[PDB]
Amino acid sequence: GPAVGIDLGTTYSCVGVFQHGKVEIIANDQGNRTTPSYVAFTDTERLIGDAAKNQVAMNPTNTVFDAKRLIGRRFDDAVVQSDMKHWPFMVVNDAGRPKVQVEYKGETKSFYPEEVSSMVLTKMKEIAEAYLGKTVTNAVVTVPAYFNDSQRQATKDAGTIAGLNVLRIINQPTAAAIAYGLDKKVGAERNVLIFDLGGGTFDVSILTIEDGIFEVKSTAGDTHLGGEDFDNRMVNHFIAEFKRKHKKDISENKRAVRRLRTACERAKRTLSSSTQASIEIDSLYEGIDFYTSITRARFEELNADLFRGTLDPVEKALRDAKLDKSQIHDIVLVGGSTRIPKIQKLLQDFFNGKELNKSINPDEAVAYGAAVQAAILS
Ligand SMILES: Nc1ncnc2c1ncn2[C@@H]1O[C@H](COP(=O)(O)OP(=O)(O)O)[C@@H](O)[C@H]1O
Ligand SMILES: [Mg+2]
Incomplete structure (x- = not known):
């Protein structure tokens, strides 16, 4: 079976496969090209994706989301402490590790964040498998550029328990660049800005590509925008x-x-x-x-x-990377929110009319890039 590329997002996930020189972003049962990163537990079943999100309004305490915010993190983590004050589901401490507690079939159960994410990963796998009509085993999963060793580990583990052989964990900005072919060697250093405004996070990354080698010069954004x-x-x-x-x-x-x-x-x-x-x-x-x-x-x-x-983090990223607006060669839009006209106008005005890379649906760009990378890796 072909290796697939999987974008495990905070609010939405997406899966693509490289076949015959083309990348295909696979749609789910409901026909959507992206699937909510939701898991729900009821008296009679475990819901994942659209089915889960479509019933949150009546089962808030047993409907889990935002697992990516917990993954690879500790309970004592300030981030966890702040975040958990806003979730309708409960987070408990199991020897320093945070766990989500829900009632499944009348029985009380708790899961580690990697187990929840594995559920979403399983959904993407079967979506790919349904489409391909064959078993999907190997995969390339993406992660934010700022994820540390523990977070990357947890993401890798979420994959293995989902029955996926994670060929490699690559950064989201790098995946986006590969989708546009900005990784091809042109004998010169190229600066690329990735503007990722998704469902719950905002990230600006400045990559410098030389000889096909990426180097994250700077990053900025807001984990709560x-x-x-x-x-x-x-x-x-x-x-x-x-x-x-x-x-x-x-x-x-x-x-x-x-x-x-x-x-x-x-x-x-x-x-x-x-x-x-x-x-x-x-x-x-x-x-x-x-x-x-x-x-x-x-x-x-x-x-x-x-x-x-939104422009503040862009200015900050620029100065940290010690570059001027004129020095960045390519700007690529990633994330569902970038489809908003006002956001595109604003960014373009900031970069004095520079053209934006946005031919590939921004909410599918990362999956697209991961699929290409999965292809080469196999
Ligand atoms: N046409 C659109 N206009 C504005 N926002 C959109 C549009 N399509 C999707 N979105 C939004 O994009 C977000 C999903 O972003 P996405 O990139 O899919 O996920 P993630 O941030 O989880 O990686 C949601 O807030 C959704 O409302
Ligand atoms: Mg995303």
Whole structure:
């Protein structure tokens, strides 16, 4: 069976395979080309991917996500301490190692973060296998450039327990560059900036490629800035609107909020191609159907400060790598949030009209690159 490339993301994962000189990003059962990094446990089953995310609103304590934030980390870790204050599922301490605790089939169980990630990895494997019609064994999995030895180990382990022979763990920025062929030798040093604005993390990496050898000169970003924050701005906006028209605050009702957030995320996606989108939610609060809409203009202004602040980490990355705007040769967009028109305008204006590399869907770029690398490695 061919070796596959797997992008194990914080919010979404994606799998691609290199066949006949072309890379194919494989779609799941629901036809999506990316699958949520979600796992859910119920009375009767274990849900993974779309099925898991599609039921979070009613099973918050038993629906796990953000496992990538825990992987390879300790319970005492300040990061873990801060983060766990925001998850509806519980994190327990098992001899210094953090574990997620859920109720599966009425019984209480706990999993190490690598076990949860292995579940998502298993889903990608069977998605590839379904498509290929053959067993998938070898794989190249990607990881952020900033992951340390423990995090890389844990990611590798998540793979082995998923029945995957991890050929190699390569950095996400490097994978993105390989997708565009920016790794080909042109007899000269090339500086490339990877702008990765995903579902929950933002990362800016500056790579220097010489003779086909990558060198991460600098990196910057924010581990808590992503498409989720954009959705939230919309949510808070609609909560206020609902209160105006119906004099009813729905903030307390967790289900109404979660359903609204789902509708916002979807509208947001439409806003990247259309200038307006409608939100049609039946019986949002009590028996009130919430029918409304948003314009791209309004969306842009709701997140103006967030979008704009995106340039700060870019300036920082530049100065650390000791380069001027003019010195970077290529700029590649990675992450689902980069499909947002305002973000593309903003970055391009910053780089004085420089063209952006974005022919490959940004949320598929890393998987795409990993597949090519998997191919050569086999
Ligand atoms: N058309 C789009 N416009 C804006 N955001 C989008 C669009 N398509 C996907 N997204 C967003 O991208 C994020 C997913 O990013 P992705 O790169 O797939 O994952 P990850 O950050 O997990 O690596 C989500 O916040 C999703 O709403
Ligand atoms: Mg990503």
